[PDB]
Amino acid sequence: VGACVLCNSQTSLRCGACIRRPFLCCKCCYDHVISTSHKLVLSVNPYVCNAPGCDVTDVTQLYLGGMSYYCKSHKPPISFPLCANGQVFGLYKNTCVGSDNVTDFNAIATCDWTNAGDYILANTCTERLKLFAAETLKATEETFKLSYGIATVREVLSDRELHLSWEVGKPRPPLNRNYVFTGYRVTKNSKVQIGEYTFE
Amino acid sequence: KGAVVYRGTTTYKLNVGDYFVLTSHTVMPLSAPTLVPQEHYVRITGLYPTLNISDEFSSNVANYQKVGMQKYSTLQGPPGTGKSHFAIGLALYYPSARIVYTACSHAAVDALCEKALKYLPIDKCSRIIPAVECFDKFKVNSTLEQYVFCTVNALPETTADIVVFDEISMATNYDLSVVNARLRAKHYVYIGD
Amino acid sequence: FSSLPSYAAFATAQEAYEQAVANGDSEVVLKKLKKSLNVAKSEFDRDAAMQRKLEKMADQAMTQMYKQARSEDKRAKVTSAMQTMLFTMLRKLDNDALNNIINNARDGCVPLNIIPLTTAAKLMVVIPDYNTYKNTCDGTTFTYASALWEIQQVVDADSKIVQLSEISMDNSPNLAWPLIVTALRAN
Amino acid sequence: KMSDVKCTSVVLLSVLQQLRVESSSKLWAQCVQLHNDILLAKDTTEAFEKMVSLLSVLLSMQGAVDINKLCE
RNA sequence: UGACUGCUCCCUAGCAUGCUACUACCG
RNA sequence: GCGGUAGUAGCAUGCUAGGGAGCAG
Ligand SMILES: [Zn+2]
Ligand SMILES: [Zn+2]
Ligand SMILES: [Zn+2]
């Protein structure tokens, strides 16, 4: 329950399909849902069909039912679509402002952070959008650098000479001091104080 | 069949009412595939290159080099064409890879162990004894060891880099799946044709 | 709903209704037209009452099947957890003295209250005050349950290691007092 | 007044429990005794003395900022 | 870490029964 | 111009399920 990211409006809705779960008010969250593939938004409880064994997450297919949210195939007779009238149902559904400027958010949310357009949009947008873009960029970087396994060293060699390998199909990580490895060595159970290293 | 001759190295006295049945096991579901698809590596990776090389088998250095470029490989040779000691000489050419030996028969491991003790060290090699006639002078419960000898029937979960499966003719796809599920490695070596 | 034969009948009924409205047909033709659409509505009432009921029944059955599958998964998980608990607590039994007392029984059956009293390699003593400490756990070694126990660790209710020198008459009020002394079997 | 001091004892023991006072067996036992005696007290003199004794536990720690919480 | 039983309120969902509501079939 | 039979929907009753909560021994 906080201010919206793209609209600075009080909201309890986090876009579940996004990375950092940004706070979005009803209108702008609906715009993000209909203009991208981010068909999952969170609340005090996640927007998902609470009927057991169901796998729908799309807010468009999700309808408010009883004390929980359901889908057309699992809705009670008293059914209420979550995303309707240009806004997804939730708290502050009446005290809402919204913003017509939702194209930038929909573009930056689905970007892989591999094109210069993402950097241009991050440098040219609202301050809240710029901060969200920076946070998501850091999250993507740390998830791409953690998308591999544990580099295992099986032998010990002389000083300043180690044959470090990579994973199966993993590209070569930056050999410069751009990434400073800060792990935690495990003796038998606990991971603590591997030390500070700088690969060169 | 030689009133049936038994090919056992031990002795036993039978009693009244004792019967022998063709006891089989329960085939568990097979998850692991036979082999992962191959891919051409640019460099010799996955195995640690050591600055000292073995000149004991000059006609196998090229074979080891070519194996180090392929994910899974198999050499087509007649029986006795270095079939029993190819992996043994590989474990000494590069003493930096977890070499795991396995066979489709428990009685065929004697041929493997005949010269392995002369070539590979005896002290640093051991065999896990489950709770049919093999060496018992080894050290049991040696989970962390460079060289591991065991059978698919009682093979616990472990990891390695190079796995050699001798006598590939008598092993079926189920046996291959069992070998790949009990032991998980990025390389698989098949000896035979 | 959208692929039933009644849809074509309804379309034909609507076309006939439009033709009658434009031409201005007789009352008998209008009644016959109504008897067609209205009993095609009878057919579709059934297709929206028995088929819709079958869809609800299928959804209910699928939900029950999902619940049963989740129950079986929970049963498997609980079975594995209980089996692992039994197998990891059996391995701490020290079956040497356990077999020594079991085989010494009349028929291999013993009361449960004596197994920890005879074959437990670790004794934990909870002491509420120093007056009971000096009687029971005096010194670095003490005798209890027809055996000799040597203290390896003493802790308080805060689970803080307290040394034997700290258990004094004057130092008693400076310690949390359910003192838990752990001892090992002597031999 | 008496109900007021008993409720203050309740909230004070609540904040003490939130401050991991129960990690100290002696301190938590003393706090529990004081809190239960305040609730069982019949006069607002013994209860207030025990309330001062219990509040001394909160004031004895550095885990609570006393200046910030006194906003008046 | 969160027992057994009993009674009572509130919300929702689906199903059995009393109506009400209109189209036409049938004589 | 007829009794409807039916039907299917606002309304009512009940029965069940699910959730939240209160008291009692
Ligand atoms: Zn917004
Ligand atoms: Zn999103
Ligand atoms: Zn559903």
Side-chain angles (χ1 to χ4, degrees), chain A residues 1-26 28-92 94-99 102-159 161-176 178-184 186-187 189-200, chain B residues 1-6 8 10-12 14-183 185-193, chain C residues 2-14 16 18 20 22 24 26 28-29 33 36-187, chain D:
Chain A
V1 186
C4 166
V5 171
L6 259 296
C7 309
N8 293 329
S9 301
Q10 300 166 146
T11 177
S12 62
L13 304 175
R14 308 175 183 266
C15 195
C18 275
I19 313 172
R20 299 306 302 176
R21 310 169 185 176
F23 267 153
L24 301 178
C25 56
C26 55
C28 90
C29 183
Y30 169 84
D31 300 330
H32 186 22
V33 168
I34 66 171
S35 177
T36 347
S37 60
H38 291 250
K39 304 299 184 62
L40 170 56
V41 6
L42 303 183
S43 305
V44 293
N45 38 23
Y47 278 165
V48 66
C49 185
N50 287 259
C54 194
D55 202 70
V56 297
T57 179
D58 184 11
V59 237
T60 307
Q61 304 178 182
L62 284 172
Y63 300 153
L64 180 70
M67 305 310 299
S68 299
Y69 329 104
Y70 303 92
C71 63
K72 169 184 170 298
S73 182
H74 292 146
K75 64 189 192 64
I78 307 181
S79 177
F80 183 87
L82 292 181
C83 49
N85 312 118
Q87 50 177 125
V88 53
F89 177 79
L91 287 183
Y92 308 100
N94 308 269
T95 53
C96 59
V97 181
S99 60
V102 291
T103 306
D104 307 68
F105 183 34
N106 306 321
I108 194 58
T110 182
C111 273
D112 310 334
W113 288 110
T114 61
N115 304 330
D118 317 358
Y119 192 96
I120 297 178
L121 294 184
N123 191 89
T124 60
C125 62
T126 64
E127 276 62 35
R128 235 287 84 176
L129 220 174
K130 178 175 55 184
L131 300 182
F132 168 83
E135 183 181 352
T136 49
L137 210 175
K138 243 58 190 63
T140 50
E141 288 187 352
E142 91 154 6
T143 317
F144 172 77
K145 208 62 181 62
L146 202 66
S147 179
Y148 311 107
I150 301 179
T152 303
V153 188
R154 193 167 47 187
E155 291 289 340
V156 189
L157 305 92
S158 301
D159 175 71
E161 210 288 331
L162 291 175
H163 259 289
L164 184 61
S165 61
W166 40 89
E167 304 303 88
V168 183
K170 171 182 177 180
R172 301 208 74 263
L175 55 94
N176 298 331
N178 185 86
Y179 281 100
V180 178
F181 283 69
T182 307
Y184 292 98
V186 191
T187 62
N189 181 29
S190 58
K191 40 177 179 299
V192 276
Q193 57 189 33
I194 200 185
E196 43 186 348
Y197 273 99
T198 302
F199 292 174
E200 197 178 14
Chain B
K1 191 177 308 305
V4 51
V5 184
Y6 49 93
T10 181
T11 177
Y12 175 79
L14 287 78
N15 300 86
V16 187
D18 292 358
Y19 50 88
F20 286 89
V21 197
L22 291 172
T23 301
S24 180
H25 61 76
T26 64
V27 182
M28 284 80 61
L30 295 320
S31 304
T34 288
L35 41 83
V36 295
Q38 73 157 4
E39 185 172 349
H40 297 176
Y41 276 162
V42 181
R43 303 173 56 188
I44 309 180
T45 183
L47 38 147
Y48 278 169
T50 173
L51 268 63
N52 55 331
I53 58 181
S54 300
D55 313 75
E56 313 173 20
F57 9 86
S58 301
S59 60
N60 294 328
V61 180
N63 307 335
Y64 299 153
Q65 168 230 11
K66 193 174 183 58
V67 168
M69 302 290 296
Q70 190 177 1
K71 301 299 298 179
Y72 68 97
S73 179
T74 156
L75 51 150
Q76 177 168 325
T81 319
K83 176 176 183 180
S84 64
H85 60 257
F86 189 79
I88 307 181
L90 175 61
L92 185 56
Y93 169 76
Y94 274 160
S96 59
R98 192 96 176 276
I99 310 297
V100 176
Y101 294 85
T102 177
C104 58
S105 179
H106 296 182
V109 78
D110 199 1
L112 316 176
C113 298
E114 186 265 87
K115 47 214 305 177
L117 66 95
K118 296 298 297 182
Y119 273 77
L120 291 179
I122 309 178
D123 48 359
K124 76 175 307 304
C125 294
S126 179
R127 183 187 187 96
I128 45 181
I129 298 178
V132 299
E133 308 295 333
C134 62
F135 307 93
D136 67 327
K137 204 182 184 303
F138 293 156
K139 313 303 295 181
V140 204
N141 301 87
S142 60
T143 299
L144 186 66
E145 207 68 27
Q146 178 185 178
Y147 303 103
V148 179
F149 287 83
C150 178
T151 58
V152 298
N153 66 335
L155 221 179
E157 53 172 0
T158 14
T159 55
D161 168 55
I162 303 295
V163 178
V164 41
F165 197 2
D166 192 64
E167 301 172 354
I168 202 58
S169 61
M170 296 186 61
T172 332
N173 311 279
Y174 155 80
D175 247 67
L176 303 165
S177 57
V178 169
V179 167
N180 192 23
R182 298 304 213 273
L183 216 300
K186 50 184 174 300
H187 284 2
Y188 313 105
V189 190
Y190 310 93
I191 315 295
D193 52 327
Chain C
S2 180
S3 299
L4 299 183
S6 58
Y7 212 96
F10 271 144
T12 304
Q14 273 295 315
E18 295 182 7
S26 180
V28 178
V29 183
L33 154 74
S36 79
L37 164 117
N38 264 5
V39 314
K41 187 65 161 310
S42 64
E43 293 182 4
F44 217 167
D45 182 20
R46 314 306 180 188
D47 302 357
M50 251 297 300
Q51 163 66 24
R52 185 161 57 186
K53 189 66 58 57
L54 287 183
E55 181 178 355
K56 180 255 182 300
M57 173 60 63
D59 296 355
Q60 169 182 127
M62 189 179 62
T63 293
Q64 190 274 137
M65 192 177 306
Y66 272 113
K67 291 197 302 295
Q68 196 70 207
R70 220 51 181 174
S71 177
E72 294 182 8
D73 173 71
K74 290 163 54 182
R75 177 192 183 173
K77 176 160 53 184
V78 136
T79 310
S80 61
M82 289 161 42
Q83 187 175 349
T84 49
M85 187 64 58
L86 289 189
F87 288 171
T88 195
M89 69 176 46
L90 108 93
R91 94 174 208 270
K92 318 192 312 299
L93 254 44
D94 282 356
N95 306 91
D96 294 330
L98 178 67
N99 283 276
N100 180 86
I101 69 161
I102 282 295
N103 288 91
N104 204 90
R106 48 198 61 178
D107 61 332
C109 179
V110 297
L112 180 58
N113 297 18
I114 69 178
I115 284 192
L117 206 135
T118 55
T119 66
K122 183 183 301 299
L123 163 64
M124 289 179 51
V125 185
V126 202
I127 310 186
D129 50 70
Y130 176 83
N131 193 274
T132 39
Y133 177 91
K134 54 180 296 299
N135 299 14
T136 300
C137 298
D138 186 64
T140 63
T141 168
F142 62 97
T143 165
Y144 166 72
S146 180
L148 193 63
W149 301 94
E150 50 109 0
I151 304 179
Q152 72 157 171
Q153 208 77 96
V154 181
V155 297
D156 50 0
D158 303 327
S159 296
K160 303 301 183 62
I161 296 181
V162 42
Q163 313 301 140
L164 294 319
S165 178
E166 291 167 290
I167 340 284
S168 304
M169 279 288 298
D170 51 329
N171 199 24
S172 302
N174 306 332
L175 303 170
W177 262 106
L179 280 196
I180 314 158
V181 25
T182 67
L184 292 180
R185 213 141 201 163
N187 49 334
Chain D
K1 176 65 94 67
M2 190 51 163
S3 187
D4 297 332
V5 70
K6 292 185 179 182
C7 298
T8 59
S9 175
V10 171
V11 304
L12 178 55
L13 196 67
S14 299
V15 311
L16 288 176
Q17 183 273 325
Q18 294 167 1
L19 287 183
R20 285 293 194 268
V21 168
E22 45 190 0
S23 299
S24 303
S25 182
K26 298 162 54 185
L27 194 64
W28 179 246
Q30 292 164 130
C31 292
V32 160
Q33 175 196 173
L34 291 170
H35 167 253
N36 296 13
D37 293 0
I38 293 170
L39 305 174
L40 290 176
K42 29 72 183 179
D43 59 326
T44 70
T45 56
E46 145 186 325
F48 255 138
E49 290 182 354
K50 295 172 177 299
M51 181 59 183
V52 178
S53 186
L54 187 60
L55 185 54
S56 62
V57 186
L58 172 70
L59 306 184
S60 300
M61 301 302 301
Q62 204 185 189
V65 186
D66 203 78
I67 42 262
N68 178 264
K69 291 307 169 182
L70 286 168
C71 192
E72 266 72 17

